[PDB]
Amino acid sequence: TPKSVLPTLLIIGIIFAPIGALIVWGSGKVTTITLDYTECDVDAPTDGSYQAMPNSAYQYDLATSSSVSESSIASPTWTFSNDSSREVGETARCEIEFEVPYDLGPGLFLYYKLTNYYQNHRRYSSSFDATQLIGDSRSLSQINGGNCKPITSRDGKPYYPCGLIANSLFNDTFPSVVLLNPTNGAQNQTYNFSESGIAWGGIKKNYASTLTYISPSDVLPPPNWALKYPNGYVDGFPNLREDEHFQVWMRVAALPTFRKLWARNDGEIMSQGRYRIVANMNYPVKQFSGTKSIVISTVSWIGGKQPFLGWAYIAAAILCVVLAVAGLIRHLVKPRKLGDMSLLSWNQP
Amino acid sequence: PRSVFIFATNQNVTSKYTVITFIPKNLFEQFRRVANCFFLAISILQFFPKFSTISPGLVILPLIIVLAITALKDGYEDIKRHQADHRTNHAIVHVLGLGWHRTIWEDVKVGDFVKIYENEQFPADIVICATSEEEDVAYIETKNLDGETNLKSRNGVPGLSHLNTAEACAKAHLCIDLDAPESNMFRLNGAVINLEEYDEDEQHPIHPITLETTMLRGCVLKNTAWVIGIIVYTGEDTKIIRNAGATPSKRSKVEKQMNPQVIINLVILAAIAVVCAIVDHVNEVEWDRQQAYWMLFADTSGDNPNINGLVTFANAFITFQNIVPISLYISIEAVRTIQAAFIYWDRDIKYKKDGVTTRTTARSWNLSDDLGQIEYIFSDKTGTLTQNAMIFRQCSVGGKIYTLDKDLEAHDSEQSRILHGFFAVLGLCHTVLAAETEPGVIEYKAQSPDEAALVQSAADVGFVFRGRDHNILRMSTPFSDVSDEYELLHVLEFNSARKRMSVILRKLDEDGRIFLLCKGADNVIFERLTKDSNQREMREKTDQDLQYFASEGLRTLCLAYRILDPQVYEQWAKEYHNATVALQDREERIESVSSSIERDLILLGATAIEDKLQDGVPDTISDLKRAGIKVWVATGDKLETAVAIGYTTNLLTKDTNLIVVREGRHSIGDQLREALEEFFGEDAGLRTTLSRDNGTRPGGFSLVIEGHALAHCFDDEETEALLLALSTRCNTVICCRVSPLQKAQIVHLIKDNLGVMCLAIGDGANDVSMIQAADVGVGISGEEGLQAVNSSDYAIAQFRYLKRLLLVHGHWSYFRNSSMILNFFYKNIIGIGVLFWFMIYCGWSTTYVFAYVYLLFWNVFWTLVPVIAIGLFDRNIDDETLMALPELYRASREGKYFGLMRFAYYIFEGVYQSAVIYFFLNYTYVTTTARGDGYDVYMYEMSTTQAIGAVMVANLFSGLNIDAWTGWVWFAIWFGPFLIWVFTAVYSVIPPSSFYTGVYGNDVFLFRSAAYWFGWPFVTIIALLPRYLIKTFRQNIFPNDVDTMRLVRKYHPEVDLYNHPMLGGKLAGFGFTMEEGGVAIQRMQSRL
């Protein structure tokens, strides 16, 4: 039997090693820039100047082919401005200037990372009404008794969209990413991140553009959407189908530390230089010891930068080779005859 | 008492359930499984609106299905029992109604008048009233212990006067004084009194009723003419039913061992729930102090913490309910039913004799795995190890053996004269009646099988017995029609230690020679001869011949001869007549008379009768003893017959020393203690139990104990402990003359003091009680009322069928059931473990990582067929090897296939594999997109990858755990994962308009992702590598007998199992039956 076991271990190792090497190579072909702007409210200058961000507020994950080092890149700088004369959703702005060490090929994606955000909690994970979202006819009793608890209705007017997931929509935007030192002339060049296509095309069908059974004045906006819809849905129902940030948010994340796509670019190259990114800080996460970050990453054949599977394959291959070598040594030392009869119970002293 | 005038209803009622009360008792016996209580609690909890997941009806549906399936199983079993009982309570018995009308065995209360004719059973206990032969005597048969035809004399004065039906109608002789119904089969009392009968004092005479007058229920098989009687002690007060017992609800040892495993799983689930509740409560209090987005609006009476901690407790019990799956018991029941069907359909345990076929039927559809753990077998002797057929085999005439007589009979040789005398003694010294219904046949109706066989052999090989048409006997020698006068009988009836029987006779010819013909045992007759020198030589030759007869195994009678002179004949006739009326010590007087007449005899030869056992019994017993099963004999027959059968069945080998314990002189406990001290004194472990003749050659010890000694042992406790020690320290124990209750007591003694599994096999009411008292009861179908068959769990027709049944079916069933249960627990632990390992990362909120469809169909679709295939078709070794090598039964008998250690190994394997799956795939999916399209990683991508990996791992683990392999194994193992893959492919394209489905687009997020395609195979390989290595190294380093034999058969098919130096070449008297007084005594009065 071990004659059919040792070659199995050798084959497993010899097949696993190339797969792990390929996964590691693909992960190393990816560049990730992380910018933690959670503490920009209090730790950033408010006079218009730029101060270097703390070493724990940013993390560069450079490609294996990069000729520069992590410490060689200049530290990003940030500034804060909280002015009440701007429109709602853009009063507080955090402008972060960061350097891209090398040209990042087409396929640049912009994410926001939330830490200590338990979307997988039982109360939150199921706090939505798919029947109401799809546009079907739901009565007050049905929505009250549905899975949308505890945000179901008030004063006889149901919430649309109801539930904890919709109420906690991430209302922090990153409107502009601008290059500060363009080589091709001009004072600055705006990197055109597009908010279209950030969600798969089938997520739209889960939601309806409008409701044909309740007038907009008979629907209450979610409690945390009050600052966005002060007097309610006075301009028609929100188009939950044509907006993709809502669809991205509604997809429950597996872990408390998760990244959700916010704008993308698929046909431009981020040239080497210094880029300024503006974040409209509107979603507080400091209350529950949470942090919000900005993640800019490319994509390889495996997706993001995660070489864990490749190293697991390599370790498995090494373990299998060691076990096969030990088994071969043991078999050569004391080879045993298969199907003997001297070790039976009756054929022993 | 009764005092019936011309009580207990009727019917055997062997049905466990009743139409009125079936649901309650069935539900109780189903809820004796603990897991059913847990399922009911979970369903009741889910009835509440807060904990509802799908619907109350669909939640209750699995439990209702389990209950309905088990109820239908039990109902089919009890319907078979009802049919078997109705075959008994709808026979034909003629009861008076001025004619004898047919009845149905039910319209028969105490009283009545029953005519039973010949060769049919009794409806209840009756009191003899009249019979057609003489003195109103009748005859009985076996099935109530013993193996000879008994006799019942008369009722005394009520005898006669009732020949026709009109006398029965016109007479109201009743008001019997019947005592209380007792289980003992040796005591009855009463008095007919009669309504119209007066003595000299104008009082109604008392007519005692004893056992010699009554005849019990279920055992007559009457061998005489019609008999009329009065039904008394009818119904459940009969001896047979009272000695029987209520039908038990037997359960396999595997279920009794499964209960602690279910309790352990429930404790683990409770610990998980407690940890989840505590951590969730602390986290929710913290997240409510600082208003998190997932804890908003937590101020109501049902959504605040504390209440949320209790809700998390309940949701933890609901989420991990598969740690004790409900599909486990349905699968177990179906597999056990199909195993019973396999037992039924086996053609090697199917009997076909005289045009009727008797398959082996499993009365209890469970207990199949119980057959594989048998350590003690308690077997009846008569009808189970014997065919109840006596065949004459060899005869010794002086010096010459026979196995030629016509050539020998030269009418001039002295050997011819001795042969003539021998056959005359054989054919004339007999209390046998000859019937002239058909000329030439000369039907012989004998009271003993030995006498019938001897007379038939004498007729077939010469001297034919004509009959007793008058007081003068006749004989048919093959020369002419001779006849000789019949003098006074001198039958000792094999009683009062008189192992002999003599018949004084006379010759009708002018010679008028008085000759005494005597037959008896070896020692008595040999010591009872006149040996000067020539009879000494004849005696030594006959002793050598009889030793030869006993060596092969035969029952031997020594014939004798004597010529009485007329003077001594008349003197002894006068002495016998005087001693006939002696009042005090009449037995002593007749013993002295017998000694006086038997003063000198001339030897004629000896016989040799074989008690034919069932075919294959010695080989079956040898194979069972090789397998390690200790076989005992519990029989109601006498000690001599039991020990002879034990010698002939290889139960008692020639190298065993017999410890015979019987009541007499020394006390039973003292006898056991002395036997232990004198035969097992050099035992270290004996002293732990000590804290309070005859034999052949050293090399082993066997115990023979009678019923009275067993009663004295069971009365107290010290004697019971001594008996247990001696019986466990002996090879085999033969229990002779035991009541049904004593058989049950022996079985209970072993099963309770030792705790070992027991099997009981027999074909009678005593066997009925013994069968009900054991773990597995086996009945033998022999057209003997079918009572043992009706009360058993398995019905076989031969002992060798028991041998195969155990060795192959029990071993296979135990192996399959153990593997199936362990794999079921393993796969459910895999699913629950993936859920739990996610619960580590979710804040312990009891949330399903998987989409609920993947957990809902975990046992219905993903993992069902590998478990069913293991439970039905898995074979550890082929049946030829198991039949050829009974020593392979050790693993099944010692319980090395099912236990807590194997359960723990499978549980921890599942825990480790689930940890590998979840953790590796989680750290794989800790990324931004997992594909080149940039779309985020949401929970259900990782969940579906983990679910597919878990299904693959579970199915391939079950596949690795199968010794046999064919196409069907591949079909099952890849039918599970095929179903999950196709379901993931199709379910993820259902548009949201048709159904929400929760996982729309996973066919794009998984089948186009490197994470999925490189995570599920890596997870599978890493999870299954330890099992593969462990199995290989266990089979190649620490191998069992079964594994080694499987390798030998696979690689060396040319090895002959039966005759191989290391495999097969190592292989690893007197008897006579008599009625013991009665009609023979009444024969003396008639011939006086």
Ligand SMILES: *[C@@H]1O[C@H](CO)[C@@H](O[C@@H]2O[C@H](CO)[C@@H](O[C@@H]3O[C@H](CO[C@H]4O[C@H](CO)[C@@H](O[C@H]5O[C@H](CO)[C@@H](O)[C@H](O)[C@@H]5O)[C@H](O)[C@@H]4O)[C@@H](O)[C@H](O[C@H]4O[C@H](CO)[C@@H](O)[C@H](O)[C@@H]4O)[C@@H]3O)[C@H](O)[C@H]2NC(C)=O)[C@H](O)[C@H]1NC(C)=O
């Ligand atoms: C971007 O998004 C973020 C979050 O997604 C937005 O921030 C949220 O904005 C909401 C709207 O302004 C805030 O809700 C309001 O909060 C005030 C005061 O807060 C306290 O109020 C109560 C104490 O006085 C009490 O309220 C309940 O809180 C929980 C549920 O909310 C319950 O469990 C609890 O038991 C209380 O019953 C809390 O202590 C709060 O801390 C309230 O007064 C407001 O109430 C008014 O509006 C509601 C609407 O439905 C109405 O019923 C009331 O009658 C009243 O008129 C309102 O709830 C929210 O606190 C805030 N969250 C955070 C974390 O900042 C942000 O505005 C948004 N920005 C943009 C630009 O879009």
Ligand SMILES: C[C@H](C/C=C/C=C/CC/C=C/C=C\CCC(C)(C)C)[C@@H](O)[C@H](O)[C@H](O)[C@@H](O)[C@@H](O)[C@@H]1OC(=O)[C@H](O)[C@H]1O
């Ligand atoms: C219809 C099916 C089950 C069918 C039962 C009917 C069976 C007929 C005979 C029994 C067959 C089963 C296995 C044996 C296969 C052979 C008959 C041996 C070929 C489902 O309807 C069943 O109900 C599912 O098994 C689940 O619904 C349930 O078992 C689920 O398990 C769990 O863990 C959940 O708590 C419970 O929801």
Ligand SMILES: *[C@@H]1O[C@H](CO)[C@@H](O[C@@H]2O[C@H](CO)[C@@H](O)[C@H](O)[C@H]2NC(C)=O)[C@H](O)[C@H]1NC(C)=O
């Ligand atoms: C930007 O400034 C506004 C007001 O200048 C802040 O809003 C106030 O936040 C405090 C928090 O302590 C509350 O007590 C007040 O009720 C809020 N409103 C007003 C009118 O003062 C806002 O939080 C600032 N944005 C930040 C810090 O990111």
Ligand SMILES: *[C@@H]1O[C@H](CO)[C@@H](O[C@@H]2O[C@H](CO)[C@@H](O)[C@H](O)[C@H]2NC(C)=O)[C@H](O)[C@H]1NC(C)=O
């Ligand atoms: C983002 O889009 C803008 C507008 O389409 C681009 O700006 C143009 O860049 C070209 C290249 O030098 C100039 O000739 C045009 O005059 C610019 N137009 C305006 C309105 O400024 C910009 O280059 C794009 N960014 C990237 C990285 O391709």
Ligand SMILES: *[C@@H]1O[C@H](CO)[C@@H](O)[C@H](O)[C@H]1NC(C)=O
């Ligand atoms: C880019 O340049 C234009 C014109 O020079 C200016 O109006 C705009 O504010 C700049 N954007 C920045 C510096 O982010």
Ligand code: BEF
């Ligand atoms: F042969 Be048993 F004693 F019925």
Ligand SMILES: [Mg+2]
């Ligand atoms: Mg019997």
